[PDB]
């Protein structure tokens, strides 16, 4: 037995936490990313990068702590602890936002490790690897949003911060500056996510309400056995119900479950494509025909133009605080605003 | 036997291609009315003075909108919460100008969807099923009711109902965030968990079932043909799926009971959507999301910013621009 | 040289449900993207 | 409205071509 086979045997032992070869990448990187996030949200400020308190130590709460993006001055520097910025100084590395690339890169490699784990375990137990394929969607989201978007922009500063309110800020930023809601790729993402939730709810309810009477208890949960060969709910009854209620119904179980995979995954992939577009400011910001008409016709008003006005307001009022490195000085009189407000 | 009995057997008949039922006897007329009025208005309705300031907003395709920007515009702020049927307008043109189509479509739609939920119960009863699919459907119904009825009631005007359009929906959401900080409302966070998790569980369940499909086809044909409608046997190996998943995370986090698994699949998104519907319904009474503006002070007393303050800046930017001509007085109380 | 029949050729199929699903997908994609095509 | 002069051709082909692809595949099915 060669040493490689012996190692392979040890890594793939049946234990409470499977390790595998993929574990060598997953567990250290995932632990680094998680511990980095926890450390930053507990102890680390964003005073020098954003002028914000972002840790429990500073008095922030769960909703307002974040591992904030690094200072815009560094561009897309990877900000290694040993890099030319921190130069091995851990305190300075924390202060310049070095924890953000730490978490982002370790999380990217952890995600790779987790999907490799899906592949490895699928191969070991002898099933098709569709779980890894489904997980490609979250990977596309993470790559586009946390890497490609800031890479197309001026710096990592404009990446989403790892935090609840940081993410909320990123969301509102994308609305105001990119008109992200108007983006058809985002609308396909929304369709996929809401459709996935709908499919989850409707399938769970349909199964639970077409169950066969296989026990005597009012508690129907123990009238199932994992090794039983027969279906536990009536597909025929479900199909008739949905055909008469909704007009159409699934008749193929396999197609049903592939659809439940397909819808949210495609939603994630389409939204990731849209985010890639936004990385280069290739926005679906305006409808030029309506802009031109409004510019020449002061009685043409649509919900689109109203939303454009909202975006202008958000940008002007938010930019000085959101982008402190720019030293934006917008005097009170240049701020757009409606009457009396 | 009797004429009425024959009619009863027809309406409650399970052999109709589309089940009608007694709830259907209300659903079908109201839903058809709402659909026809919605289509007509979306195509050809004239501009509507939503904000009650004689500032009509063009919602229909024929008045310069595309599909994305088109909408059925909520009724005028001057109407408030008053009932505005066609017969209370001096003319059809007045009714159109004041946004009557919105009230017609919305009221019929709401009646229709409640009757749709009742009809789901009814058909489940006629087929000998368990009765709780309608309970799951009560979540989207609750959300729709929150955005079309409850929020306008609390705010005091159907002009503050969600417009029936894509861009109108976005406008609704942006203004809602500016006024209520819905992102920082825990019920909306629970709704986000509901939909993100529902999509997650949909992807996992579909992928685990697809991954564990029993071999019944060749590599040429679709694996879907391995399942025959109405077959008694199971089409996938749930034990293999459990082995895979319980090794992916750990054994005791994996369902091996399909019934418990499917109950969880039903319950998670439904509960999340109930919570987010209640969030909108309670923000209708201006119980808003968390406000941590200037929560962190330094020792001297100067405010230290957090991401909540940046969020508040964005909210103010939305707030000062929205309905730019509608406000006369400094506080946006209405 | 000789022209010999290729034994690797196979029939393609699209069942009626797949047709309805594809037609709906195409129609809704057109609905979505037409506004942006017109701009 | 001054819309893109390629909008009609783009939208019509965007719908039409996949439509005829599906139609061809469906109609020939079972041959």
């Amino acid at each position: 037995r060669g040493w490689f086979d012996v190692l392979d045997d040890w890594l793939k032992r049946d234990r409470f936490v499977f390790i595998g070869w993929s574990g060598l990448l997953l567990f250290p990187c995932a632990f680094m990313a998680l511990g980095g996030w926890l450390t930053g949200t507990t102890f680390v400020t964003s005073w020098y990068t954003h002028g914000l308190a972002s840790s429990y130590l500073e008095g922030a709460n769960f909703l307002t702590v974040a591992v904030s993006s690094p200072a815009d001055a560094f561009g897309h520097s990877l900000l290694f602890l040993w890099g030319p910025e921190a130069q091995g100084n851990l305190t300075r590395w924390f202060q310049i936002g070095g924890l953000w690339p730490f978490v982002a890169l370790h999380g990217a490699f952890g995600l790779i490790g987790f999907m490799l784990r899906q592949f490895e375990i699928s191969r070991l137990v002898g099933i098709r690897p569709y779980n890894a394929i489904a997980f490609s969607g979250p990977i596309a989201v993470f790559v586009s949003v946390f890497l490609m978007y800031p890479l197309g922009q001026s710096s990592w500063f404009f990446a989403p911060s790892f935090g609840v309110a940081g993410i909320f800020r990123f969301i509102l930023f994308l609305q105001g500056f990119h008109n992200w809601t108007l983006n058809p790729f985002h609308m396909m993402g929304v369709a996929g996510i809401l459709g996935g939730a709908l499919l989850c709810a409707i399938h769970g309810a349909t199964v639970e309400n077409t169950l066969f009477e296989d026990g005597e208890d009012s508690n129907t949960f123990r009238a199932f056995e994992p090794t039983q060969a027969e279906e536990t709910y009536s597909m025929v009854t479900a199909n008739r119900f949905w055909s008469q209620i909704f007009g159409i119904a699934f008749s193929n179980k396999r197609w049903l479950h592939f659809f439940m995979l397909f819808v949210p995954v495609t939603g994630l992939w389409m939204s990731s494509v849209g985010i890639v577009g936004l990385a280069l400011n290739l926005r679906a910001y305006d409808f030029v025909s309506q802009e031109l008409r409004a510019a020449e016709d002061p009685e043409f008003e649509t919900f689109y133009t109203k939303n454009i006005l909202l975006n202008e307001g958000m940008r002007a009022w938010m930019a000085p605080q959101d982008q402190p490195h720019e030293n934006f000085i917008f005097p009170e009189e240049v701020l757009p605003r409606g009457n009396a407000l | 036997a009797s004429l009425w009995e024959q009619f009863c057997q027809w309406v409650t008949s399970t052999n109709n291609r589309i089940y009608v039922g007694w709830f259907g006897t209300l659903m079908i007329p109201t839903l058809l009315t709402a659909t026809t009025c919605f289509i007509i208005a979306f195509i050809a309705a004239p501009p509507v003075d939503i904000d009650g300031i004689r500032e009509p907003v063009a919602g229909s395709l024929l008045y310069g909108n595309n599909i994305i920007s088109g909408a059925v515009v909520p009724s005028s702020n001057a109407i408030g919460l008053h009932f505005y049927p066609i017969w209370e307008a001096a003319s059809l043109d007045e009714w159109l100008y004041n946004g009557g189509p919105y009230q017609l479509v919305v009221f019929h739609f709401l009646i229709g969807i409640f009757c749709y939920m009742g009809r789901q119960w009814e058909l489940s009863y006629r087929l000998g099923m368990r009765p709780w699919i309608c309970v799951a459907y009560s979540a989207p119904v609750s959300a729709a009711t929150a955005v079309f009825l409850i929020y306008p009631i609390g705010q005091g005007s159907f002009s503050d109902g969600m417009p029936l359009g894509i861009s109108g929906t976005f406008n609704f959401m942006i203004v809602f965030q500016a006024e209520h900080n819905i992102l920082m409302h825990p019920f909306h966070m629970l709704g986000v968990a509901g939909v993100f998790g529902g999509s997650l569980f949909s992807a996992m369940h579909g992928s685990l079932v697809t991954s564990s499909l029993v071999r019944e086809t060749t590599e040429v044909e679709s694996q879907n043909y391995g399942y025959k409608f109405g077959q008694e046997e199971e089409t996938y190996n749930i034990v293999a799926a459990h082995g895979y998943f319980g090794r992916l995370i750990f054994q005791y986090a994996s369902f091996n009971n399909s019934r418990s698994l499917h109950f969880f699949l039903g319950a998670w998104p439904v509960i999340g959507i109930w919570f987010t519907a209640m969030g909108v319904s309670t923000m209708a009474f201006n119980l808003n999301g968390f406000n941590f503006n200037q929560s962190i002070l330094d020792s001297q007393g100067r405010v230290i910013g957090t991401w909540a303050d940046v969020l508040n800046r964005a909210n103010i930017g939305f707030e000062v621009m929205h309905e730019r001509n509608a406000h006369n007085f400094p506080l946006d109380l209405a | 040289m000789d022209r010999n029949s290729n034994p690797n050729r196979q029939p393609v199929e699209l069942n009626r449900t797949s047709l309805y699903l594809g037609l709906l997908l195409v129609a809704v994609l057109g609905i979505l993207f037409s506004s942006y095509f017109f701009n | 409205m001054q819309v893109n002069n390629l909008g009609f051709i783009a939208s019509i082909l965007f719908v039409l071509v996949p439509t005829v692809f599906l139609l061809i595949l469906f109609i020939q099915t079972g041959k």
Partner: peptide, 30 residues
């Protein structure tokens, strides 16, 4: 005239719905 295109695509989707309901492939137990 882009209204015509919008109406066209919407009508296409609706017609697909009616055919998918009325002329669906019947589920058959076999």
């Amino acid at each position: 005239m882009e209204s015509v295109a919008y109406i066209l695509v919407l009508t296409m989707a609706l017609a697909v719905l009616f055919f998918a309901i009325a002329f669906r492939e019947p589920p058959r137990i076999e």
